[PDB]
Amino acid sequence: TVSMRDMLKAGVHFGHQTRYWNPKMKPFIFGARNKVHIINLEKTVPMFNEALAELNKIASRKGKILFVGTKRAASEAVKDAALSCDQFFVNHRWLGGMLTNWKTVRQSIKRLKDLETQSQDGTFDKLTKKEALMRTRELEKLENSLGGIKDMGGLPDALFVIDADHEHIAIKEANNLGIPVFAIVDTNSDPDGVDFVIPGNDDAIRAVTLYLGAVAATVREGRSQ
Amino acid sequence: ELQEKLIAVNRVSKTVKGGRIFSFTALTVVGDGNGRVGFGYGKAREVPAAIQKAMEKARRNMINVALNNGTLQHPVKGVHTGSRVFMQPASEGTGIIAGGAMRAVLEVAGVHNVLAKAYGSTNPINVVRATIDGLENMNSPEMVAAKRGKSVEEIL
């Protein structure tokens, strides 16, 4: 859904230097300019379009999608995209065992709900106001971590990741559980744990917005279909 | 359903300021009477908790084994860390001729006719890993036919 000079305008072809690169990205690197590898958008476009086709496959049958990025640059973009396509997001730190120890994290989803019930809607005023602030920074912390999935209830069916090494933990938890993985694999990353590899830059805000808007589109179109 | 066998229990220790802390380990293997096999290793302060943790991990992490009628398909070898393991398909009703942990894993594997031999170290954990690796990388005539791009009859 995104053309190549669209990707080239956003800055998808950029990457990292030549002393940080993974030799598995050789089939994805075009060249090297200014001691920086260049991502072959000839292979970027049809792989991103294969991923969006499988996204339209899962959201056809109403699968659950989790957006994963905690790069402190695409945090708001991954939030606005998951609330656009009303799917679930992780913008701040992926908790270790969010998927595998779901039955334990569930008890903090429930704690976040009861704290939001009590304070905003429940109007749980008139307590010891210092504990009301300990409740406050508790609810702030729980919304900062678990707010994107508090309505998910069960395990998701597909995971879309911005960086395969900054978020390599979520890859392993998905790889154990048989959950498919769609990921933006930059030059310094490992493309083996990713079921659908998408080469491209990871720090570029324009490219993150391009990827996310193309996914929130083909998900809303797959939802309606 | 899924038959479950514990192979061995073991008491371990952990020395602290107060003294020795004892614990128990349990090595269990599960299987469906066919190629679906899986092992577990649990550990707790108490033996029934350890078997229950082991059966829990064994019911997941199952592995699929392309059996023949009731036996293997070719003489396969498996290693893990101390334990070279040889196993061989055998004639009908010759039994499971196998040592220790391999008998239990093949019994829940649904095999019934093997000629096995465990060389090296016979630590049950590593020898059950070596059998799981041997059965897992044992390949069928269909898989080799699709791989080489020929028929099964061209393979014989």
Added chain:
Amino acid sequence: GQKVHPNGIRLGIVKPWNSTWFANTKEFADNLDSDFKVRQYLTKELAKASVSRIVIERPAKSIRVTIHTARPGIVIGKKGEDVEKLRKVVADIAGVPAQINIAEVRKPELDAKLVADSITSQLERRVMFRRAMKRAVQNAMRLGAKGIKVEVSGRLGGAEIARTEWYREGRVPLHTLRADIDYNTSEAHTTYGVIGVKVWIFKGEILG
């Protein structure tokens, strides 16, 4: 040799005394002997009865014994048959006119003396101590206890080396003073010795 008795430490806050009377020093130790002898008698007689707490109160030279028990049918029999039989011997012991009241124990699985005596009876009839401790914990947490700790001690399974074991489920804050800790202790007289049982039960915090 370390821990204070949780009842005696909670006696002014959330726990009541089992003897609530007043006397001067002249008749104090005499009342207290009379209370001891009657608690002795009632425990031996109502051993099969699930008695928990014998409360003694004496106003106006008339003793009033309030027995808390899990089943009052075997203690009473007919209405004032066995109770009246025990009442006239209580008045014989105390030397004063007696009165017996019976408070039924809802949820006998949430009473420490009953649980410890049930475990003691099981150990006396030779059950596995761990099964008895498990079923006591599962039953109490099922019945709704916020936290239970049991502990047995000594000559377990006839083993010449005495050790203690204890299970815990839920939170049992002993240092919290406003905690409703029901604590009591039993003894099993096996053929191999004496097995001691302690039981802590946390019901919740009283907000006085």
Added chain:
RNA sequence: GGCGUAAAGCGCACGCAGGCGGUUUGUUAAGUCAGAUGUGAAAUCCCCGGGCUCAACCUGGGAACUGCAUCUGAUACUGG
């Protein structure tokens, strides 16, 4: 089966005998492979049977004795 640390790489090197030996064509046929013949005593072991009331046992026939020699071929490999 092993030899960094568990036993175990000579302190290092040159180097005779010895072991091994790139690639192509031709020849040889030594090795090798195939076949045939002779032999490899019988018994024994094994197979199919037979006989003692069964078995042990006895026994018929066969296979086997994986070897050696000669001859006839084969020529990819190794050697010449």
Added chain:
RNA sequence: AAGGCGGCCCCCUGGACGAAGACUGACGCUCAGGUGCGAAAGCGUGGGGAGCAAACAGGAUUAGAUACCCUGGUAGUCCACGCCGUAAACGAUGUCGACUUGGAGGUUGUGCCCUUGAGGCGUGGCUUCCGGAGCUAACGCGUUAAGUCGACCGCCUGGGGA
């Protein structure tokens, strides 16, 4: 080659590497026995002898102190020629060859680009650190393998006794 080699100059002299070509045409690898080299200490003969310093002597220390510390100090250390033939003689990893993802360097050549600066692109030799697959009991090794293979040699078979 290993042991090992450190002012400067000369004489004699060995080896390595690189660039282009030319030539010979498998002449090669390994190696029991054998032969040669082989730190320091030590031995022999003849010299030399500043410093250091086993031994030794004295002083202290200490319960003692045939030691550590101090003051001295002889063989020895040095040179020539011979002998010894050992070391934790260690990378505790035999030699030769082939293949197998990378990164940052050091050193030493060499080609090319306008050296438009000390730069830019390569291509050879040697070397250090990290580390992937894989291996390994683990530690760790990891294109200079302890990975995948081949050729040959040497060696091991419970601890002492030895």
Added chain:
RNA sequence: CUGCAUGGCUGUCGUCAGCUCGUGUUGUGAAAUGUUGGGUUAAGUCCCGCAACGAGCGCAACCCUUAUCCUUUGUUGCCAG
């Protein structure tokens, strides 16, 4: 008689701030993580960070007494007017 057959009770390290578990993950495994790191505190006290998320016994508070004030009640206590 046996505290070296036991219960119970007590000392002690030490009112020291520590000790552990569940699930998850790593490791063939004993085990590890959590409980570590940066700060801070009397404190594993709190915050931030982080393959851990959580929970429990303990660290604290809840108790008593003292220290100031108020109201009520004033004898056997009090004496400003």
Added chain:
RNA sequence: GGCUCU
């Protein structure tokens, strides 16, 4: 500065 054994 040194300061043994159990």
